[PDB]
Each structure stands twice: as C-alpha cells, then as structure tokens.
PDB file of C-alpha atoms and ligand atoms in Angstrom:
ATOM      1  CA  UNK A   1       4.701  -7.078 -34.615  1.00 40.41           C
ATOM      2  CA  UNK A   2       3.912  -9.638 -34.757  1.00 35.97           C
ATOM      3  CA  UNK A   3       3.057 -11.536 -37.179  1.00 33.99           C
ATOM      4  CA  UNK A   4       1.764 -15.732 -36.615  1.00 33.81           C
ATOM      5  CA  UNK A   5       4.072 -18.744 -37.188  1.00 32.69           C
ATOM      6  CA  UNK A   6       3.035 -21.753 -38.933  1.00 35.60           C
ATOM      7  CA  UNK A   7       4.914 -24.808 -37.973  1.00 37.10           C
ATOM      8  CA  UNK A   8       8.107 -26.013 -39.246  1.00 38.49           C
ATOM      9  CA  UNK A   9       7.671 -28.207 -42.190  1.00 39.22           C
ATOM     10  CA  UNK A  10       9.328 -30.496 -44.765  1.00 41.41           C
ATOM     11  CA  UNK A  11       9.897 -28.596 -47.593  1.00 39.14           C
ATOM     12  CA  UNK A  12       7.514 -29.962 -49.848  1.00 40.02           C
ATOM     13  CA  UNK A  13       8.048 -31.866 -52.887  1.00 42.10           C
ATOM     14  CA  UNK A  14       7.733 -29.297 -56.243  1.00 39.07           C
ATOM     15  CA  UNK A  15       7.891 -30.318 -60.242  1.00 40.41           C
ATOM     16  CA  UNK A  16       9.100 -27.117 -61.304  1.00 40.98           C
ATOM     17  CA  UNK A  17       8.258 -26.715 -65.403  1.00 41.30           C
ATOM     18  CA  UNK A  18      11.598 -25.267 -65.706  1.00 38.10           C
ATOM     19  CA  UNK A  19      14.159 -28.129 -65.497  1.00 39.35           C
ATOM     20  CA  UNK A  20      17.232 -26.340 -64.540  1.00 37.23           C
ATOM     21  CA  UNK A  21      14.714 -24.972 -61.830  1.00 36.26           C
ATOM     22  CA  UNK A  22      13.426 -27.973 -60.781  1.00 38.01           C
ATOM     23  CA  UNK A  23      17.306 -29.761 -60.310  1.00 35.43           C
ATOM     24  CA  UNK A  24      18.417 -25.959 -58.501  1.00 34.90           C
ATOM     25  CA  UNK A  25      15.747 -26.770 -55.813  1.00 36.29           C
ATOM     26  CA  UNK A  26      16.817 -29.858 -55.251  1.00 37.09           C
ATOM     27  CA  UNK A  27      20.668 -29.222 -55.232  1.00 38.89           C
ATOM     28  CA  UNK A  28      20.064 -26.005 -52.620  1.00 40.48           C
ATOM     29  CA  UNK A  29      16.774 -27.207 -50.990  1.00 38.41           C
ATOM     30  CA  UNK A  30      18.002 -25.972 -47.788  1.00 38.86           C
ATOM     31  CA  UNK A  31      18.694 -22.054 -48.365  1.00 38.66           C
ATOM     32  CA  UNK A  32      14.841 -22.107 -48.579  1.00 37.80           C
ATOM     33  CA  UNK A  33      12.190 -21.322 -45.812  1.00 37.26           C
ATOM     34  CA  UNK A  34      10.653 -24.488 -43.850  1.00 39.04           C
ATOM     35  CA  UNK A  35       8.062 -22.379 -42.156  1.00 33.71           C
ATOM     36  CA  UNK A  36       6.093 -19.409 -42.667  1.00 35.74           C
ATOM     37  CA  UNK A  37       5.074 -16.003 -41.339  1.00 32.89           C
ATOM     38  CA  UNK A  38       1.823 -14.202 -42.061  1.00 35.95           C
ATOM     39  CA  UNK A  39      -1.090 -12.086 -40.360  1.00 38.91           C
ATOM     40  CA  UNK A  40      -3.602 -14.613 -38.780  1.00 37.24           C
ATOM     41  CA  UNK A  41      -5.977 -16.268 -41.039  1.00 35.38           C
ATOM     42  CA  UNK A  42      -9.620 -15.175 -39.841  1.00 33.26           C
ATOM     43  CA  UNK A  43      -8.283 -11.859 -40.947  1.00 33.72           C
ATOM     44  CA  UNK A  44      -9.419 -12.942 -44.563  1.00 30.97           C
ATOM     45  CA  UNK A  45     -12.061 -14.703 -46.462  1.00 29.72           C
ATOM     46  CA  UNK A  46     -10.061 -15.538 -49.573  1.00 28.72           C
ATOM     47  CA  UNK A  47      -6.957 -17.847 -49.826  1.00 31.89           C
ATOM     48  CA  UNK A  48      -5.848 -15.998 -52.506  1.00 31.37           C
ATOM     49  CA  UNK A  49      -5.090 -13.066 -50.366  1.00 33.26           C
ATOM     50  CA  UNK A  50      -3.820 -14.879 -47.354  1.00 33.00           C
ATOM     51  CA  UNK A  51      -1.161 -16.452 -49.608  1.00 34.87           C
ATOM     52  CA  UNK A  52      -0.237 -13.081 -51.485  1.00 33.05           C
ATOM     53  CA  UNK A  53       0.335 -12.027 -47.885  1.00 31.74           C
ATOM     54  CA  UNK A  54       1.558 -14.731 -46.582  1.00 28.79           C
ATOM     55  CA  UNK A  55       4.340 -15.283 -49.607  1.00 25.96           C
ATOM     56  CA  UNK A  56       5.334 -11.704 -49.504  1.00 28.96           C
ATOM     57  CA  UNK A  57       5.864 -11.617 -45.534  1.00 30.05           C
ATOM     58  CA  UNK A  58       7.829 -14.838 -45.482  1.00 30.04           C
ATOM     59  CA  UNK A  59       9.880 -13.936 -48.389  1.00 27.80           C
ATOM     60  CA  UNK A  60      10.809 -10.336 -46.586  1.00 23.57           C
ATOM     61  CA  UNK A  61      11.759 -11.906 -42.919  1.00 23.50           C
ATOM     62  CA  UNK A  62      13.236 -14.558 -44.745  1.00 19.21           C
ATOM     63  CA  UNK A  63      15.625 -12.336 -46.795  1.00 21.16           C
ATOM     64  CA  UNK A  64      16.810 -10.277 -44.494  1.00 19.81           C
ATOM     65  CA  UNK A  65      17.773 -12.803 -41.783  1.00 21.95           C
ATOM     66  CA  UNK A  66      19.984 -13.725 -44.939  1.00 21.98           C
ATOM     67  CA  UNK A  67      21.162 -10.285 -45.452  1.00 22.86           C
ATOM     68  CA  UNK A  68      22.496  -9.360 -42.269  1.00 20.88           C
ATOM     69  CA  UNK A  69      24.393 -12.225 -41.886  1.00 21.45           C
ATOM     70  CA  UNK A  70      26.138 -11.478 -45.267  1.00 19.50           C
ATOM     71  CA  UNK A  71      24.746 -14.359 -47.609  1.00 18.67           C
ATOM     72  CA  UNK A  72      23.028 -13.761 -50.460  1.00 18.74           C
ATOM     73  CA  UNK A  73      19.796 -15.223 -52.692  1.00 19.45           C
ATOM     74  CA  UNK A  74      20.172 -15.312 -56.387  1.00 17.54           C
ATOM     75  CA  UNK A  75      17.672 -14.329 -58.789  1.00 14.40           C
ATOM     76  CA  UNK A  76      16.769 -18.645 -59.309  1.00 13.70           C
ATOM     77  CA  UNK A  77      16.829 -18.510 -55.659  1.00 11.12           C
ATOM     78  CA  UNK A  78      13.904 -15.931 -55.456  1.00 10.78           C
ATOM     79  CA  UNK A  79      11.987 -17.382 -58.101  1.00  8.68           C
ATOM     80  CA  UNK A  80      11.899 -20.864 -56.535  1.00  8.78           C
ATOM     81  CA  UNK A  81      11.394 -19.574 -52.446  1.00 10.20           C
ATOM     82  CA  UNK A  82       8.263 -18.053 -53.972  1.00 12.00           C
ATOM     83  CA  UNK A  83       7.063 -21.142 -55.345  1.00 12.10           C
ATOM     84  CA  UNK A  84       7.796 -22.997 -51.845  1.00  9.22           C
ATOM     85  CA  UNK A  85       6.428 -20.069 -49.820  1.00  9.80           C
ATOM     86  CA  UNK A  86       3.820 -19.830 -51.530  1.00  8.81           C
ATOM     87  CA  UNK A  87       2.653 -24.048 -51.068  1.00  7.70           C
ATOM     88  CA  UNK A  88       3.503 -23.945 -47.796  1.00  5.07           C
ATOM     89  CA  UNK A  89       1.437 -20.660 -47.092  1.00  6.74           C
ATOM     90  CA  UNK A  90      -1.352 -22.649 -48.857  1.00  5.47           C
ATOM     91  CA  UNK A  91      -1.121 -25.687 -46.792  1.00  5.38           C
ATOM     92  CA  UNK A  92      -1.201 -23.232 -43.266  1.00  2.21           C
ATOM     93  CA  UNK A  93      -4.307 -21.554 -44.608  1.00  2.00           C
ATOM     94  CA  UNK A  94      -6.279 -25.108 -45.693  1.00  2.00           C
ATOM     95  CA  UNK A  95      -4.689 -26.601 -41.879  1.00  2.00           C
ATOM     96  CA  UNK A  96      -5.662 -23.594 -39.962  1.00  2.00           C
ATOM     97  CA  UNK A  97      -8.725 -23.072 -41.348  1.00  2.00           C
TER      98      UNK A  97
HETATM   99 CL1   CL B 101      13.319 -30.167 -45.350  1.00  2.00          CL
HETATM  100 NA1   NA B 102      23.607 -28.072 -51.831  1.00  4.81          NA
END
C-alpha cells in the first residue's frame, strides 16, 4: 500500500434507466461505498483512466471487507456499486484536480 482516500460522501443521487435498479438503490442505499480508494491523481492525465482505476480499486477493498465478515453482494448489488463508485470516483478526480 497504500492507496489515497477521498472523503466520505453522501451517496449521490442516481436515475438508474433500469427501474427495478433504480428502486434496489434506493431500498439498500447503504450496503454501498460512501468513499473511495484509488492511486493519487497526478499519476494520470485522463479521467477516464483514473475512474477505471479508481472504480475497480474501490469495488475490490470494498468487497472483501464484505467477504470476511460473511455478507454477501448480489449480482444487482455489483451492477449498481459500480455506477456509485464510479460518480463518486469522478467527483474526487474533478475536486482534487
Ligand atoms: Cl449516504
Ligand atoms: Na434497506
């Protein structure tokens, strides 16, 4: 390690296209990250590849902590932490830089 922190955030507000998607957010907002992990921003020049980072460190620390404590993600879950990962990895690069 390590890898940088950003802040803890309110987990942002998200229409998800897919309705049941968009209510299964809202009814389990919480099992979701408020903060994210990534390698320090002035390591890249494109936000693109900050947030590809960024989305695929969070989602790894984030998923284990679960793991080991013997919870579990389903597959919605997955599909929606990478949608809020990835805005929130977004707003840290835009902020930081
Ligand atoms: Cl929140
Ligand atoms: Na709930």
């Amino acid at each position: 390690g390590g890898y940088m922190l950003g802040s803890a955030m309110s987990r942002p507000l998200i229409h998800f296209g897919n309705d049941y998607e968009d209510r299964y957010y809202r009814e389990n907002m919480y099992r979701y990250p408020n903060q994210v992990y990534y390698r320090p921003v002035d390591q890249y020049s494109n936000q693109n590849n900050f947030v590809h980072d960024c989305v695929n460190i969070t989602v790894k620390q984030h998923t284990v902590t679960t793991t080991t404590k013997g919870e579990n993600f389903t597959e919605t879950d997955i599909k929606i932490m990478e949608r809020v990962v990835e805005q929130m990895c977004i707003t840290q690069y835009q902020q930081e830089s």
